[PDB]
Design a protein around this ligand. Structure first.
Ligand SMILES: */C=C/C(=O)N1CCC(C(=O)N(C)CC(=O)N2CCN(c3nc(-c4cnc(N)nc4C(F)F)nc(N4CCOCC4)n3)CC2)CC1
Length: 853
C-alpha cells in the first residue's frame, strides 16, 4: 500500500538504516522478533485510544510530576501557611490580549480546582479548560495536586512564581492527530533426558591474518575450566578438534553461553578475535550441528584472552574471521525443560545469631565480595532468606549454576519470591544475573513499583542493560517499549538513547529492530523525530566541515563560513521549527544567527540560539540556547548529571537545601551531543579576567566576592551568599565522592544570584581546592564555615546511605563502552571514597580528614 511505503521511508530516515534491510535478514529470531513485538505496539495503541481524546492527550502530554505528593519540611515551610501564589493567564481577543489573574490557593489543589478558582476570580468584574505551562508545551492534564508537578515544586523551591495559561480543552484536542497505527506487511523433542558431557568440535577458521581458547560461562562466571585447542600454524587454520568440558549436558543453566577467541603466541599470548554463542536459541532449543560464527575485533584493555561480557551473535560484517563449529546432535531436537518439569525435579531434589548474620550480609554493598563459606551459608539458609528479600542478589550469587538441582530449586524460590524496591530490582539486571527467571522477577518488580518519573530517572541504565539480554524478544524490552509507546516523554529519550548507538554494529541489529517497532507504533511524533534527526544531520555536516576543511582558519573566517553555510535555505529549513532533543516540550523556531557562534575552546563547539515561539515565551524564556558538540564523548557527562540530579533529590527529600544544577545533556550519536545553556552563568576564570586589575596584571582570586556583591546589592547579598555556600558544599561532596577530573577556574561556573555548578566532566573515578575566592565568599574561623562543614558532613552521610543505588547504577552502565568505566575495579573507587567497609563514625572521621587536606 501507500501508507506502508511512506511509513517505511520515514522510519528508515529516522533509524538511519532502511527498513528493507531487516527483511533481507534470513534469521528466524529476527523475523520472529519483528512479528511478536507488534503485540506490545497493539497494547500501547489500544491504551492510547482506550478513553477517547483524553487518553491520547495524556499520552502526548503526560504530567511531569514527582513520585511522591508529600513535600519535605523545608519545602512546605516556603509556602504561605501551606498555600502557594499562582498566576493564571488567559488569551482573549483575536489580538491575543493576555490577561493575568493572581490566586493564592492550597498547594494540594487539583488543576480542576485551580481552573475553578481562576474562573471565579475572573468573573468578579464548567470543566472545559486545562492548564498549560507558560513558555513550553507542558500540560497539567491530570488530577494531581498542583505542588506535585515538577514545575510547581521547582517554582516553590526557587522562589519563582508559577505562571500558567488557561486553555480550552477542545483547542488542545483539535491539535491531536487521529493516529492510525497500521499493522506492517511482514506479519501476514527430548528434554534433559540426554545424559552426557558437553563437547564441541572446532572445525576451521577463515579470514585469519595460533590456537583457539574456549569456555562455558553463565554471565561472567565460568561453569567449568577453559579449554585450549591444539596450537596450529596460522597458515592452515584447521583444527577439527573436539573439546570436552567438565559439565553434564542437563546441568547447563538456561543462560549458558560459549565464549571463544583466537589467540597467538610469540610465551606472549594475545587475543585476536572473539565471539560468543547462546547454547540455547530463543525457542529454548539446544543448538546442534554446524554453525558459522564471524568474530569481533578485540576491545581496548582486555585483561583475559576471552570477552564473555561481550554481546552475543555473529558479526554483521561477514568479511571478518569466521570460525566453523559443530555441536553434538542426539536422538531428536533438544529443548530446555518446562517450568513444570523444573518444579517436579525441585520437589524431588537456624539460630538468632545466624539470622542477624544473614541480615548483616544483606546490608553489605554489591561490590563487596562474598566468601565461599558465606556462599554455602546463604545456600543452606535459602528458605529463611525469603523473609529478608533484599538479600536476593547475594543469594543468587551464592548459587552453583552448574547444577540443575540447585537451579531448579532457585527457580522455585523465585516463582514466589516477594517483590523488592526498584532501586534494588535493577541490581538483578546487570551482567551478573543473566538467568531468565531472575530477570523476569526484576522486570515484574519494575512494572509493579516503578513510577514513570523514576522510569525516566533511570531510563538510560535500563536501555543499557538491554544489551545484556540473551535474546531479542524478552520481558525487559517489552516493558520498556510499552512504556515508551504509552508515554511520549519516556519514548523521546528511549528513541534517542537507542539511535545514539546505532553506529555500534555490536547492537545495531537489536536497537535497529527495536527502533523499527517503536517508530511503527509511536504515532505522529515520528515526523518531529525526523525533523530533529535532519537538524542534527545538518549540524553534524557543518561541524564536520569546520573541523577539517576550514579547521586551521581564524575565528572570524570560520565564523564567516558558518554564517554562509547556516543560511542556504536547505539548511535553514532543517534547523528551524522543531522540538529540542534535550526537552521535546521546548519549541525551537527561527535561528537567531546573530546570536550563534563557534565556542572556540576545543573541537569547535557550536553555540546555537533559537527564539521561543511559545505564545507566552516571555514568561519562561524568549530565547533557548544549546551547545551542539561534535567531537568528544558525552555519555560520561550524561551519567554524571543524572547522578548529580539524584543526589540533589536525595538531599531535598532528606531536608538539606543544597541547590545543585543538573542541566540537560543528551548524546545523540557517536561523540555527537547537545548541552543545555544555563542563562546568566559565567566561569570563575571569566570573573577573574573581567575583574583583572588591568590588561597587563595578575588575576587575584579575592575579587569573586566583589563581583557577587556588585551583582547582588542590598538584602539580596545574604541570599546570594547562602546560595553560593550551599551549592558549593553540594558540589564539593559530589566531586569528592565521584572523583571528577581536574577542576580549575574555567570548569566551575556561577550565576548572577550566587549559584555554583560544574561543567565538562572529563574523567571520573581516577580535593575541591576551595580557592580562597570560595572561602572569602562563605565569609576560616567563622560560624559560616562551621555551618558549611556541617552541610558537607550531612551530605556525605546522606550519599553513603545510598552507596548501594549508586554502585548499582555504575555496574549497570558498565555495559556502555565508556573509557573511565571498563571494569568493577573502576567502580571500587566509590566503595573507597564512601568507606563502605568502615562504620558510620569511621567514614565521618575519614571525610573530615580528607577535607582538612
Ligand atoms: C582571561 C584572559 C583570556 O585569555 N581569555 C580568553 C578565554 C576566555 C574564557 O575563559 N572563555 C571563553 C571560557 C568560556 O566562556 N566558555 C564558554 C562556556 N563553556 C561551556 N562548556 C560546557 C561543556 C560541558 N560539558 C562538556 N563535556 N563540554 C562542554 C563544552 F565545553 F564543550 N558547557 C557549558 N554550559 C553549561 C552551563 O550553561 C551554559 C553552557 N559551557 C566553556 C568555555 C576569557 C578571556
Amino acid at each position: 500500500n501507500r501508507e506502508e511505503k511512506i511509513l517505511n521511508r520515514e522510519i528508515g530516515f529516522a533509524i538511519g538504516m532502511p527498513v528493507c534491510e531487516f527483511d533481507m535478514v534470513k534469521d528466524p529470531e529476527v523475523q520472529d522478533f519483528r512479528r511478536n513485538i507488534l503485540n506490545v505496539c497493539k497494547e500501547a495503541v489500544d491504551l492510547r485510544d482506550l478513553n477517547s481524546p483524553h487518553s491520547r492527550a495524556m499520552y502526548v502530554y503526560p504530567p511531569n510530576v514527582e513520585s511522591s505528593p508529600e513535600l519535605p519540611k523545608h519545602i512546605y515551610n516556603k509556602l504561605d501557611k501551606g498555600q502557594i501564589i499562582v498566576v493564571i493567564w488567559v488569551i482573549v481577543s483575536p489580538n491575543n490580549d493576555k490577561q493575568k489573574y493572581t490566586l493564592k490557593i492550597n498547594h494540594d489543589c487539583v488543576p480542576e480546582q485551580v481552573i475553578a478558582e481562576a474562573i471565579r476570580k475572573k468573573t468578579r468584574s464548567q470543566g472545559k479548560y486545562i492548564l498549560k505551562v507558560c513558555g513550553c508545551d507542558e500540560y497539567f492534564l491530570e488530577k494531581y495536586p498542583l505542588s506535585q508537578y515538577k514545575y510547581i515544586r521547582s517554582c516553590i523551591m526557587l522562589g519563582r512564581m508559577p505562571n500558567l495559561m488557561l486553555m480550552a480543552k477542545e483547542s488542545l484536542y483539535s491539535q491531536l492527530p487521529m493516529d492510525c497505527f497500521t499493522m506492517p506487511s511482514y506479519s501476514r523433542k527430548s528434554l534433559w533426558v540426554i545424559n552426557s558431557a558437553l563437547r564441541i568440535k572446532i572445525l576451521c577458521a577463515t579470514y585469519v591474518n595460533i590456537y583457539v581458547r574456549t569456555g562455558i560461562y553463565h554471565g561472567g562466571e565460568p561453569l567449568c575450566d577453559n579449554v585450549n585447542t591444539q596450537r596450529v600454524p596460522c597458515s592452515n587454520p584447521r583444527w577439527n578438534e573436539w573439546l570436552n568440558y567438565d559439565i553434564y549436558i542437563p546441568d547447563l543453566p538456561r543462560a549458558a553461553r560459549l565464549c571463544l577467541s583466537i589467540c597467538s603466541v610469540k610465551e606472549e599470548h594475545c587475543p585476536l578475535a572473539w565471539g560468543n554463542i547462546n547454547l540455547f536459541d530463543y525457542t529454548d532449543t539446544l543448538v546442534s550441528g554446524k554453525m558459522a560464527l564471524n568474530l569481533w575485533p578485540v576491545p581496548h584493555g582486555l585483561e583475559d584472552l576471552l570477552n564473555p561480557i561481550g554481546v552475543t551473535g555473529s558479526n554483521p560484517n561477514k568479511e571478518t574471521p569466521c570460525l566453523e563449529l559443530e555441536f553434538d546432535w542426539f536422538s531428536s531436537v533438544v529443548k530446555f525443560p518446562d517450568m513444570s518439569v523444573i518444579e517436579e525435579h525441585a520437589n524431588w531434589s537456624l539460630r538468632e545469631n545466624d539470622k542477624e548474620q544473614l541480615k548483616a550480609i544483606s546490608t553489605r554493598d554489591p561490590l563487596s565480595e562474598i566468601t565461599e563459606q558465606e556462599k554455602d551459608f546463604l545456600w543452606s539458609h535459602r528458605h529463611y532468606c525469603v523473609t529478608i528479600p533484599e538479600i536476593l542478589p547475594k543469594l543468587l550469587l551464592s548459587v552453583k549454576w552448574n547444577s540443575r538441582d540447585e537451579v531448579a530449586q532457585m527457580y522455585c524460590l523465585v516463582k514466589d519470591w516477594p517483590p523488592i524496591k526498584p532501586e534494588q530490582a535493577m541490581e538483578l539486571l546487570d551482567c551478573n544475573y543473566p538467568d531468565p527467571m531472575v530477570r523476569g522477577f526484576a522486570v515484574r518488580c519494575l512494572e509493579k513499583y516503578l513510577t514513570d518519573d523514576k522510569l525516566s530517572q533511570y531510563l538510560i541504565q535500563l536501555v543499557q542493560v538491554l544489551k545484556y539480554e540473551q535474546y531479542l524478544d524478552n520481558l525487559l524490552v517489552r516493558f520498556l517499549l510499552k512504556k515508551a509507546l504509552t508515554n511520549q516523554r519516556i519514548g523521546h529519550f528511549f528513541f534517542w538513547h537507542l539511535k545514539s548507538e546505532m553506529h555500534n554494529k555490536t547492537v545495531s541489529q537489536r536497537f535497529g529492530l527495536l527502533l523499527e517497532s517503536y517508530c511503527r507504533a509511536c504515532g505522529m511524533y515520528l515526523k518531529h523525530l525526523n525533523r530533529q534527526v535532519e537538524a542534527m544531520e545538518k549540524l553534524i555536516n557543518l561541524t564536520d566541515i569546520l573541523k577539517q576543511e576550514k579547521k586551521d582558519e581564524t575565528q572570524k573566517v570560520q565564523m564567516k563560513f558558518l554564517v554562509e553555510q547556516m543560511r542556504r535555505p536547505d539548511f535553514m529549513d532543517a534547523l528551524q521549527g522543531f522540538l529540542s532533543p534535550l526537552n521535546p516540550a521546548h519549541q525551537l523556531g527561527n535561528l537567531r544567527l546573530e546570536e550563534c557562534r563557534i565556542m572556540s575552546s576545543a573541537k569547535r563547539p557550536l553555540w546555537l540560539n533559537w527564539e521561543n515561539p511559545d505564545i507566552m515565551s516571555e514568561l519562561l524564556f524568549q530565547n533557548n540556547e544549546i551547545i551542539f558538540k561534535n567531537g568528544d564523548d558525552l555519555r560520561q557527562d550524561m551519567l554524571t548529571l543524572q547522578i548529580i540530579r539524584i543526589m540533589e533529590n536525595i538531599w531535598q527529600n532528606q531536608g538539606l537545601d543544597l541547590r545543585m544544577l543538573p542541566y540537560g545533556c543528551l548524546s545523540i550519536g557517536d561523540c555527537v551531543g547537545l548541552i543545555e545553556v544555563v542563562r546568566n552563568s559565567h566561569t570563575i576564570m571569566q570573573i577573574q579576567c573581567k575583574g583583572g586589575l588591568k590588561g597587563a596584571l595578575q588575576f587575584n582570586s579575592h575579587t569573586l566576592h566583589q563581583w557577587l556583591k556588585d551583582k547582588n546589592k542590598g538584602e539580596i547579598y545574604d541570599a546570594a551568599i547562602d546560595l553560593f555556600t550551599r551549592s558549593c558544599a553540594g558540589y564539593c561532596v559530589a566531586t569528592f565522592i565521584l572523583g571528577i577530573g581536574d577542576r580549575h577556574n574555567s570548569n566551575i561556573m556561577v550565576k548572577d544570584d550566587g549559584q555554583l555548578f560544574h561543567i565538562d566532566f572529563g574523567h571520573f573515578l581516577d580535593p575541591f581546592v576551595l580557592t580562597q575566592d570560595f572561602l572569602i565568599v562563605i565569609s576560616t574561623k567563622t560560624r559560616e564555615f562551621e555551618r558549611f562543614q556541617e552541610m558537607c558532613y550531612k551530605a556525605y552521610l546522606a550519599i553513603r546511605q545510598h552507596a548501594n543505588l549508586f554502585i548499582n547504577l555504575f555496574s549497570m552502565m558498565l555495559g556502555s563502552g565508556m573509557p573511565e568505566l571498563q571494569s568493577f575495579d573502576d567502580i571500587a573507587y566509590i566503595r573507597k571514597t564512601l568507606a563502605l567497609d568502615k562504620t558510620e563514625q569511621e567514614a565521618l572521621e575519614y571525610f573530615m580528614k580528607q577535607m582538612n587536606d
